[PDB]
Chains A and B, each alone.
Chain A
Amino acid sequence: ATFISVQLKKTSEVDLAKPLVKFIQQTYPSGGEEQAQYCRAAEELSKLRRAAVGRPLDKHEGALETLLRYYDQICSIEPKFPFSENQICLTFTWKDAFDKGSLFGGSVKLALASLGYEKSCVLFNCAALASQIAAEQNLDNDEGLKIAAKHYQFASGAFLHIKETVLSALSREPTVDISPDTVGTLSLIMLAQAQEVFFLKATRDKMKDAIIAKLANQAADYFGDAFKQCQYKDTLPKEVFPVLAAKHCIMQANAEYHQSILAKQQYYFGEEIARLQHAAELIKTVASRYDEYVNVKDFSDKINRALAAAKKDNDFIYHDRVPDLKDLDPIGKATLVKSTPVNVPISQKFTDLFEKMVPVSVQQSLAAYNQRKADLVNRSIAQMREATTLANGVLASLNLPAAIEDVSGDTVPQSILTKSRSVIEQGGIQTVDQLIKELPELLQRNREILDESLRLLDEEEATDNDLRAKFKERWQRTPSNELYKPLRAEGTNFRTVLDKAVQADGQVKECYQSHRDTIVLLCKPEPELNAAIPSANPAKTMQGSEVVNVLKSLLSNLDEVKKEREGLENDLKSVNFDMTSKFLTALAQDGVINEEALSVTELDRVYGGLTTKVQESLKKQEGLLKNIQVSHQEFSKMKQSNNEANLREEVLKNLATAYDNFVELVANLKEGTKFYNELTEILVRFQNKCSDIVFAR
């Protein structure tokens, strides 16, 4: 007794472990735990593929579960490591199952850089192995029937998921064995054979002839359609074709023999004979043309016995007329069977080794959220500094707030005195002088490292080239040159960063020495500074003039505005929203993540409160400045211009310009310092990447 099954596909073994490990690490903090269980698992994945595929050997649900275990893992991994972003050189290689192509060869292989191909083949192998476990079952037994019926339905379904999967996944022309048509015929053969089994159960349980006829008819339909699909495409092993033919016929004959007992029960004797006669024919033909592939004797003996007896009873007793087949009513059909849908996990006891790993669909979303947060926050900071710079400059250019706290021309206007004591407290000129002094040294410290590093590479290369020169035979590894170009290109990059930093140092030095002398003035004790400021007679009617109080309250409010920018910049900076979860959600509930629109709305709930105010700050400045210059220009027409207060005037404006510069310089200087300090960090790692690669090589 003989059922069709499919042979597995052969693969060459590949290293899964290590092209995955490259991404794993280049994505996570090297040496941490979020990488510990991700290299331990990737090796256990490479192991698993080996046991799943590495040998066409084992032949039970020991080895099937291993394959199913493998399919489930291979599917769980696709939404991680960027497969859908072709850069991983994991190339999978399978051979046709049947030794088939669309040319007259004797085998054909196909290697592809796609997980989609990998998974189509594994499933085909899951289906084929299932087909083999099913065809082996002892069908006299209830566990036998149950297991055949379940595996055939599994196989049919696995083959059909392939039919619907292949072309969209695999971006090439597949081998014949996994093409839609082949795999669609295989699916139907498996479905047919599942019916066959349900027919055999019903027979064994002695169910009604009505039921049995209909199950057999249905099997016959299924084998027929499969036969037809085979008739003009020879893409299956040569034995599939005759065997479908015989099974179709046997199924028809089984259908008729049962329908014929039913007719005898209803006393349609001519009919019984007509159906018996058709069964005898089908079996006669089967026995003689498909002997090789079937045994049909018992059935044939039983048909003949029924036929002789029915003809005896008829010829002598009943005298019923025997109809032509065309006038017989169709036997009905009953399927009891379905293609099993494929829904991972298809394996018992499944656990996703890499469950913890975050989907790439999120990484890209999470990293691209940052570059929109950054763009929003920096943008807003910059606008605000650019505005404060401009206001302070305009104020200076109009001697404000100095001019209105300037009772006589005799003392240090309160504001200047505040700014002075402010300068003196922050350390005065020493704090700017000491930061200028150490800047060439932080530059030099970073040059040292870049150079010590590349010279390592140079020295090692000089000798590798000499060893190749003098020991041709004994010394052959890829030259240092090639191994080193990646590092050396980081090298020339760093160089560019240094050249920009030097230019930046240039701007700060020139500014610093362009503004030193005045700053030094501002830092003097109160009377010493008062002596150095020229005195003037005041324009005395500045008692309580309306232009003065207006300017005053307007300055109080411009002040207000700029002191508020500090707490804005701090709230802009001190908050953030972790977005992972929002993406995780949008991925689980919906199909994909669209961060574009999902971030724009969250950036608005998080930052909108502050971005609103930042804009309200600028317009409020523009407002306050427009009607301060008009209010000033009128103020000046009230306080005349002579030499003694022009002199006081410039010194005053220049002392205010001096305050701005000190504050700005400290900030540029500290920025330079921080930069040169973070840069040493980056360059020490680079120094070690260099020495490690000279110590390995």
Chain B
Amino acid sequence: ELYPLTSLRSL
């Protein structure tokens, strides 16, 4: 994972 789209989409 490069940019944290995980952290991003959950918020």
How many B residues touch A, CB cutoff 8 Å?
Answer: 8
Report if A504 contacts B (CB, 8 A). Answer: yes
Complex CA gap A24/B3 in Å reads 33
Q: Is the CB of A504 within 8 A of B8?
A: no
Q: Is the CB of A682 within 8 A of B8?
A: yes
Q: Which residues of A contact B4 (CB under 8 A)?
A: 497, 500-501, 504, 675
Residue of B nearest to A498 (CB): B4
Q: Is the CB of B2 within 8 A of A679?
A: no
Complex CA gap A392/B10 in Å reads 33
Complex CA gap A120/B7 in Å reads 44
Q: Is the CB of A497 within 8 A of B7?
A: yes
Most buried by A among B3, B4, B11: B3
Complex CA gap A678/B2 in Å reads 15
Report if A671 contacts B (CB, 8 A). Answer: yes
Residue of B nearest to A382 (CB): B1
Measured CB to CB, the closest approach of chain B to A302, in angstroms, equals: 84
Report if A672 contacts B (CB, 8 A). Answer: yes
Complex CA gap A497/B7 in Å reads 7
Residue of A nearest to B11 (CB): A682
Q: Is the CB of A504 within 8 A of B7?
A: no
Q: Which residues of A contact B9 (CB under 8 A)?
A: 678
Complex CA gap A324/B11 in Å reads 89
Q: Which residues of B contact A675 (CB under 8 A)?
A: 3-5, 8
* Chain A, 520-553, CB within 8 A of any chain B CB: none
How many A residues touch B, CB cutoff 8 Å?
Answer: 15
Residue of A nearest to B9 (CB): A678
Provide the A632-654 mask, 1 if CB < 8 A to any CB of B, else 0. Answer: 00000000000000000000000
Measured CB to CB, the closest approach of chain A to B9, in angstroms, equals: 8
Q: Is the CB of A507 within 8 A of B2?
A: yes
Report if A380 contacts B (CB, 8 A). Answer: no
Cβ-neighbour of B2 out of A496, A497, A668, A682 (below 8 A): A668
Q: Is the CB of A501 within 8 A of B11?
A: no
Q: Which residues of A contact B11 (CB under 8 A)?
A: 493, 497, 682
Complex CA gap A508/B7 in Å reads 19
Complex CA gap A493/B8 in Å reads 11
Q: Which residues of B contact A671 (CB under 8 A)?
A: 2-3, 5
Complex CA gap A260/B5 in Å reads 91
* Chain A, 664-688, CB within 8 A of any chain B CB: 668, 671-672, 675, 678-679, 682
Measured CB to CB, the closest approach of chain B to A564, in angstroms, equals: 25
Q: Which residues of B contact A501 (CB under 8 A)?
A: 3-4
Complex CA gap A493/B4 in Å reads 13
Residue of B nearest to A490 (CB): B11
Measured CB to CB, the closest approach of chain A to B5, in angstroms, equals: 6
Q: Which residues of A contact B7 (CB under 8 A)?
A: 496-497, 500
Complex CA gap A364/B8 in Å reads 21
Complex CA gap A675/B7 in Å reads 11
Complex CA gap A671/B3 in Å reads 7
Measured CB to CB, the closest approach of chain A to B1, in angstroms, equals: 9
Measured CB to CB, the closest approach of chain B to A377, in angstroms, equals: 14
Complex CA gap A500/B1 in Å reads 11
Cβ-neighbour of B8 out of A507, A508, A668, A679 (below 8 A): A679
* Chain A, 488-504, CB within 8 A of any chain B CB: 493, 496-497, 500-501, 504
Q: Which residues of B contact A497 (CB under 8 A)?
A: 4, 7-8, 11
Complex CA gap A679/B9 in Å reads 9
Measured CB to CB, the closest approach of chain B to A668, in angstroms, equals: 6
Q: Which residues of B contact A507 (CB under 8 A)?
A: 2
Measured CB to CB, the closest approach of chain B to A316, in angstroms, equals: 103
Q: Which residues of B contact A668 (CB under 8 A)?
A: 2
Complex CA gap A672/B2 in Å reads 9
Provide the A591-606 mask, 1 if CB < 8 A to any CB of B, else 0. Answer: 0000000000000000
Complex CA gap A660/B5 in Å reads 23
Complex CA gap A493/B2 in Å reads 18
Measured CB to CB, the closest approach of chain B to A37, in angstroms, equals: 28
Q: Which residues of B contact A672 (CB under 8 A)?
A: 2-3
Complex CA gap A501/B2 in Å reads 8
Complex CA gap A367/B2 in Å reads 25
Complex CA gap A504/B2 in Å reads 6
Measured CB to CB, the closest approach of chain A to B2, in angstroms, equals: 5
Complex CA gap A500/B2 in Å reads 9
Measured CB to CB, the closest approach of chain A to B7, in angstroms, equals: 5
Provide the A470-509 mask, 1 if CB < 8 A to any CB of B, else 0. Answer: 0000000000000000000000010011001100100110
Most buried by B among A493, A497, A508: A497
Residue of A nearest to B2 (CB): A504
Can you report 25 A-B residue pairs in the complex whose CB atoms are below 8 A from each other? A493-B11, A496-B7, A497-B7, A497-B8, A497-B11, A500-B3, A500-B4, A500-B7, A501-B3, A501-B4, A504-B2, A504-B3, A504-B4, A508-B2, A671-B2, A671-B3, A671-B5, A672-B2, A672-B3, A675-B3, A675-B4, A675-B8, A678-B8, A678-B9, A679-B8
- A675-B3, A682-B11 given. 17 additional CB < 8 A pairs? A497-B7, A497-B8, A500-B3, A500-B7, A501-B3, A504-B4, A507-B2, A668-B2, A671-B2, A671-B3, A671-B5, A672-B3, A675-B4, A675-B5, A678-B9, A679-B8, A682-B8
Q: What 7 pairs between A and B have smallest CB-CB spacing?
A: A675-B3, A500-B4, A504-B3, A497-B7, A504-B2, A671-B3, A672-B3
